[PDB]
Design a protein around this ligand. Structure first.
Ligand code: MN
Ligand code: MN
Lengths: 87, 196, 433, 22, 118, 82, 293, 56
């Protein structure tokens, strides 16, 4: 029951000393643009600036996008929702 | 049952928060009832805070809001005088015709279609017309024919001189373009106004 | 508040602890008034030049009035010498008597930007604006912003403290008139701090938990970074050019002050990276940029090929400007990483990662003769790996026969780039003494 | 190190600071 | 090498079965050795294996192992192997009690895919 | 033993088209995935996935495909030298 | 001729806006005209932005009227409804009549895709046939609308970036040229590239897999990524799986599942979403919950 | 044949004390070129004739 995760490629070359490793992208990033600043690449900087300012002067992620089959769990949504309507 | 002022004052604290909330049905309900508050509370207080709410509503995501807000703005201009609108509302609504989005440029056209009814003729000719006419060349087909739709409604309010001088070239130009639908609206408006 | 605190600073003997308490409250709640560049200009000199000049030149200055200046100023283009004469006598006045003229100058700063006015008018207006800044900054900043909006809302103080980038939404003609760019940067530097204070107070007010605090911190970091980014965008030349040297110098000073004020801004602006046409400017303009050699090693580790390409390019100019053992210990790592990415990169990205970074290697060679054989080994290796890849698919130029010596294919472009770099490194070594 | 003291200068004798993945 | 155990449920088994990716090597011998090691571990843990006391027909642990493969040449980081050499080193204690890794109850069936491209 | 080392000088990626044996490509995919090089792991996966070769064809097509790839490789190889 | 017919169509539009279905002869004349107006569009009927993409409808007329209230009236805001607008609804006939009427009135202010549910077999056993027989008595209108359902396009392309199709990708299909070469004048076969396009869906699996629906397949993250690379597409939009937020991203911002039929079957209670792309391809999102009845 | 300067020069949903309208962009947006090859039909025949003669 333990998953195996690929590691960051460590490439010390004999042509900051002897222990360096260029990072390898990990799919499970899920960057928190709101909680941290070094995300928000340069292009969308203005958008995320305005959006964070609004969100504050008025949560961590603007898009939820649950990939689970939970999108089709109308049953669980109903159990969450109260409905005492009975004839 | 309860005079305007009593309940208006009672609800004034919560109007602004209620003026923007999740559901849009309640926003529509408010925007429908605001002009009574405007009349009750006079020009000064409305310009102090309510004007901002009306202007914010003029660009709401939903379309029912936009339309209802423009209709309500129709009431406000006649309640508070033509000069008041020419002073406060016109410079902003008319300025709203330049953003990259086309939705707001459609909102401006609806607002012009509505206000030109109440705002007399000289003000419409020297403020509204020039912009509407200059918008005829917009690359967006939607606005391109909805401009003809607006001209159809606004034509009766001009004087024959202004129409035959400037409107006719724009309308005949619209017929020249390639989009069948805008061409049909151009022909329809041309025949309705009997300019040719 | 500013006027009173200056008066209290002047008179310290009497007011026992009031001066200390007031200054604490100012510096803690109103940081957009404790900007050293503002208070330093107050001390002027002890040269008494201003005093002696004023005592003998004010006399009866034919009773100049705000309306008189306004009259002349409404037709300044028709008559500029009148305006020159009026403001020349304005400069002598004390910091108080100038307040009545705040509206006249600030309100009508638009047409100053019009071409033709000798820059003496602008310099004198800048000096007057600084004098007024030393007295009443709060009102003055709002007046100036709403006067320099492009040709029109009336921004408020509370509005600007929310989104200070509103300062930069000004007439594009501002970005090419040195004296007014100075004032715009002053406002920007003030209002960024003001925004920090405003958010800090607002969160405490609305608390009626940490998530909010680090949201505030993230917002402020991004806000400072964006301000720096638009400033660099200003330094970039516009296509029309293809004055700017003075504008870039003023922006360089401002950026230097921000960088000294906080390092994290240095670490964030760079991890975002900025148009690399600017490196030759900033590397020299901002003397406090040597710090980058600290975290470039961290930067290169980032997966994004864009970030790595930027890192190597930056390191190129840093090595030229500074030649230190740390700089070389990082330049070696740069070449090792390039060798590694050579092995680990498909061709479609090999082109996109090697074409805009190879001209960086001549800079390394210029800086460090010791780090030379590795450079040449990597260059020949990449050259012949690209050459081998060339034959795999038919080409129309077939650069192989060029051995005895437009929009082409990527690999041909890459080979031509390597040839140019080798020519360039040979030239730099021949003429490098 | 010493952002304002300059690397070549006489020496005086006597909350997320990194990328989220990194 | 293992994805779903006995205590695991059908939901987890489905998840792991579906979410698989193909990036390993055809180490059929090692994989079979691991599977049989798990099975024999379970069978000695149960203790129904009456060594030195005959073989009990009633004591049964019927298991069927379906392996799926293409039948390609066996691959190993050392190189290609033309014969199925099941490793003889058994870190699992008690293997010596039985000559073969498997027992009489367990049956193995192999599916070999041979679908033509066209 | 040759693919193992990291000192390649022969445009290691572009040549995956010519290789036409499934087993060596399986080795390549394993090596790339282990060393963490996805941009080439995907190329290897695509090369394997190509329908031309499947190790189960009636071999009439397999021999022709191997011959064609040999021709292409030797032609490029001859172009490279001299 | 054309002018008088246009005014006549206007009366049908306003009447349908009042939930009043047209006469059988009017339906016949509408279907006949629609054949000639849909024959001229290839499989990938390209549509220029701006646009307002709308997900599954399943013929819920009150919901569609609220959707018009939200997005805007059809002549103003261009729309790209995606299929499944004929079934599991008590006003399916009215909904489909309104959609086809809008399409015929305006050739390019709207465009309707073909969902899995618009075929001869499915409608017979999922209500629409029963609804038509109950309302119009006979099945003449049914054999008109089922005939029309074949002439619909299969996929839409927005400014060469967005790819809108009801179901999803398919192992047989690989490129837009294949879609263009597919022939649509055929009731959806039970197995084939056309079949799967209307029954595909996303999943967190990878590779492929038989769909539990019994038709089509289920694609994985890598499949969508590879297909997008193959053809320069940057985002695929489908609407076949019911959702809650109304719009959900999957495959790391590669496929958007849209659903614009709130409170599915009157009991799910799910919200509904609508996507809209401005002229500069600046996507947004709106959400809603069915209007009071 | 076959930036931030401008972005902030107009921004903020025209409200300023409120968020921005859209929730993002799907990519670069508006693939610009849409460019056609119409260099010249003529004399391409003659170039083809030259190549064909060489082949013959
Ligand atoms: Mn459906
Ligand atoms: Mn469907």
């Amino acid at each position: 029951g333990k998953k195996v995760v690929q590691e960051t490629g460590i490439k010390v070359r004999s042509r900051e000393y002897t222990g360096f490793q260029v990072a390898l992208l990990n799919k499970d990033l899920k960057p928190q643009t709101f909680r941290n600043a070094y995300d928000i690449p340069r292009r969308n900087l203005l958008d995320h600036l305005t959006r964070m300012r609004s969100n504050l002067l008025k949560d961590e992620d603007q898009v939820h996008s649950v990939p689970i089959a939970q999108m089709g769990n109308y049953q669980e949504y109903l159990k969450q929702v109260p409905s005492p309507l009975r004839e | 049952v309860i005079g305007i002022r009593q309940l208006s004052q009672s609800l004034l604290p919560a109007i602004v928060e209620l003026a923007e909330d999740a559901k849009w049905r309640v926003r529509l309900a408010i925007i429908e009832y605001m002009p009574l508050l405007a009349g009750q509370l006079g020009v000064e207080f409305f310009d102090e805070k309510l004007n901002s709410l009306c202007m914010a509503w003029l660009v709401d995501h939903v379309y029912a809001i936009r339309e209802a807000a423009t209709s309500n703005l129709k009431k406000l201009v006649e309640k508070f005088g033509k000069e008041w609108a020419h002073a406060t509302i016109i410079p902003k609504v008319l300025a709203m015709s330049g953003d990259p989005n086309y939705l707001h440029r459609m909102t401006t056209l609806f607002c012009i279609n509505v206000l030109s009814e109440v705002c007399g003729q000289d003000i419409t000719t020297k403020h509204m017309l020039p912009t509407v006419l200059r918008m005829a060349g917009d690359p967006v087909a939607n606005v391109r024919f909805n401009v003809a739709k607006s001209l159809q409604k606004i034509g009766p309010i001009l004087d024959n001189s202004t129409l035959q001088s400037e409107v006719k070239p724009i309308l005949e130009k619209l017929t020249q373009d390639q989009d069948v639908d805008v061409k049909y609206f151009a022909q329809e408006a041309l025949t309705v106004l009997s300019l040719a | 508040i500013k006027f009173l605190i200056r008066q209290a600073q002047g008179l310290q003997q009497e007011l026992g602890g009031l001066h200390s308490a007031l200054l604490r409250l100012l510096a803690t709640n109103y940081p957009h008034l404790c900007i050293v560049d503002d208070w330093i200009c107050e001390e002027e000199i002890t040269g008494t030049d201003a005093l002696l000049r004023r005592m003998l030149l004010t006399n009866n200055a034919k009773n100049h009035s705000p309306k008189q200046l306004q009259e002349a100023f409404s037709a300044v283009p028709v008559n500029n010498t009148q305006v020159m004469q009026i403001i020349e006598h304005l400069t002598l006045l004390s910091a108080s008597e100038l307040i009545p003229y705040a509206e006249v100058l600030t309100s009508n700063m638009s047409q100053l930007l019009n071409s033709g006015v000798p820059r003496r008018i602008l310099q004198t207006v800048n000096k007057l604006w600084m004098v007024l800044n030393t007295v009443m900054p709060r009102r003055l900043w709002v007046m100036t912003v709403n006067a320099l909006q492009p040709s029109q809302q009336k921004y408020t103080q509370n509005d600007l403290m929310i989104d200070p980038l509103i300062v930069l939404r000004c007439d594009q003609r501002v970005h090419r008139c040195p004296p007014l760019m100075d004032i715009t940067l002053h406002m920007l530097n003030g209002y960024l701090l003001a925004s920090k204070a405003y958010l800090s107070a607002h969160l405490k007010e609305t608390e009626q938990e940490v998530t909010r605090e680090e949201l505030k911190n993230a917002l402020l970091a991004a806000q400072d970074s964006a301000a720096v980014q638009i400033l660099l965008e200003i330094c970039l030349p516009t296509e029309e050019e293809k004055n700017l040297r003075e504008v870039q110098c003023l922006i360089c000073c401002l950026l230097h002050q921000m960088y000294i004020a906080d390092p994290n801004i240095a670490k964030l602006v760079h991890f975002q990276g900025y148009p690399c046409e600017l490196l030759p400017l900033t590397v020299a303009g901002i003397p406090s940029m040597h710090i980058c050699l600290d975290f470039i090693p961290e930067l290169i580790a980032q997966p994004e090929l864009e970030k790595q390409i930027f890192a190597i390019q930056l390191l190129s100019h840093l090595c030229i400007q500074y030649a230190l053992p740390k700089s070389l210990s990082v330049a070696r790592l740069a070449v090792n990483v390039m060798g590694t990415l050579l092995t680990v990169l498909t061709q479609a990205k090999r082109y996109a990662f090697f074409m805009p970074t190879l001209p960086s290697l001549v800079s390394f060679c210029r800086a460090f003769p010791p780090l030379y054989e590795d450079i040449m080994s990597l260059l020949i290796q990449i050259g012949q790996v690209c050459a081998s890849d060339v034959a795999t698919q038919t080409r129309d130029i077939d650069p192989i026969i060029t051995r005895l010596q437009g929009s082409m294919d990527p690999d041909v472009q890459l080979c031509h780039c390597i040839e140019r770099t080798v020519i360039e490194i040979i030239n730099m070594s021949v003429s490098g003494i | 190190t010493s952002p304002s003291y300059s690397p070549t200068s006489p020496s005086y004798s006597p909350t997320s600071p990194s990328y989220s993945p990194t | 090498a293992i994805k779903a155990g006995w205590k695991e449920n059908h939901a987890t088994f489905m998840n792991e079965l579906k979410n698989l990716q193909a990036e390993g090597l055809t180490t059929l011998g090692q994989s079979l050795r691991t599977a049989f090691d798990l099975l024999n571990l379970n069978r000695l843990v149960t203790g129904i294996d009456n060594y030195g006391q005959g073989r009990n027909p009633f004591f049964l642990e019927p298991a069927i192992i379906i392996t799926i493969t293409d039948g390609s040449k066996l691959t190993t980081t050392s190189g290609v192997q033309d014969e199925l050499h099941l490793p003889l080193n058994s870190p699992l204690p008690g293997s010596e009690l039985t000559k073969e890794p498997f027992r009489w109850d367990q049956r193995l069936f192999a599916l070999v895919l041979r679908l033509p491209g066209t | 033993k040759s693919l193992q080392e990291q000192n390649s000088h022969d445009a290691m990626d572009s040549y995956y088209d010519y290789i036409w044996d499934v087993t060596i490509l399986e080795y390549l995919t394993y090596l790339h995935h282990k060393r963490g090089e996805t941009d080439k792991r995907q190329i290897a996966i695509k090369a394997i996935g190509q329908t031309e070769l499947n190790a189960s064809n009636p071999e009439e097509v397999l021999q022709l495909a191997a011959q064609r790839r040999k021709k292409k490789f030797l032609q490029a190889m001859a172009k490279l030298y001299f | 001729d054309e002018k008088v017919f246009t005014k006549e169509l206007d009366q049908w539009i306003e009447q349908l806006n009042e939930c009043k279905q047209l006469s059988e002869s009017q339906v016949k004349s509408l279907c006949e005209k629609a054949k000639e107006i849909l024959t001229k569009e290839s499989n990938v009927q390209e549509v220029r932005c701006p646009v307002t993409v709308c997900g599954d409808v399943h013929g819920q007329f009150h919901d569609l009227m609220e959707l018009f209230r939200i997005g805007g009236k059809s002549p103003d805001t261009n729309y790209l409804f995606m299929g499944d607008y004929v079934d599991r609804g008590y006003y399916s006939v009215e909904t489909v009549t309104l959609l086809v009427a809008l399409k015929v009135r305006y050739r390019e202010r709207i465009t309707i895709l073909r969902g899995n549910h618009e075929s001869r077999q499915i409608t017979q056993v999922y209500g629409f046939y029963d609804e038509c027989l109950r309302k119009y008595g006979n099945a003449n209108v049914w054999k008109y609308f089922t005939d029309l359902f074949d002439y619909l396009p299969l996929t839409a392309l927005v400014d060469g970036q967005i790819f809108c199709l009801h179901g999803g990708l398919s192992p047989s299909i690989d490129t837009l040229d294949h879609i263009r070469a597919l022939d649509r004048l055929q009731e959806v076969p039970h197995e084939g590239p056309m079949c799967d396009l209307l029954w595909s869906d996303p999943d967190d699996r990878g590779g492929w897999g038989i769909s539990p629906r019994g038709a089509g397949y289920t694609f994985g993250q890598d499949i969508s990524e590879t297909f997008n690379h193959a053809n320069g597409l940057t985002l695929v939009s489908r609407a076949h799986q019911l959702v809650m937020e109304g719009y959900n991203w999957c495959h790391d911002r590669n496929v958007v599942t849209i659903f614009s039929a709130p409170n599915y079957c009157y009991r799910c209670g799910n919200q509904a979403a609508i996507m809209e792309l401005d002229d500069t391809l600046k996507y947004s999102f709106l959400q809603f919950d069915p209007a009071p009845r | 044949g076959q930036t931030n300067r401008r972005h902030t020069a107009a921004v903020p949903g025209p409200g300023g004390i409120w968020s921005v309208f859209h929730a993002g962009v799907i990519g670069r947006g508006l693939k610009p070129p849409k460019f056609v090859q119409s260099r010249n039909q003529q004399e391409v025949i003659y170039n083809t004739q030259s190549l064909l003669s060489l082949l013959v």
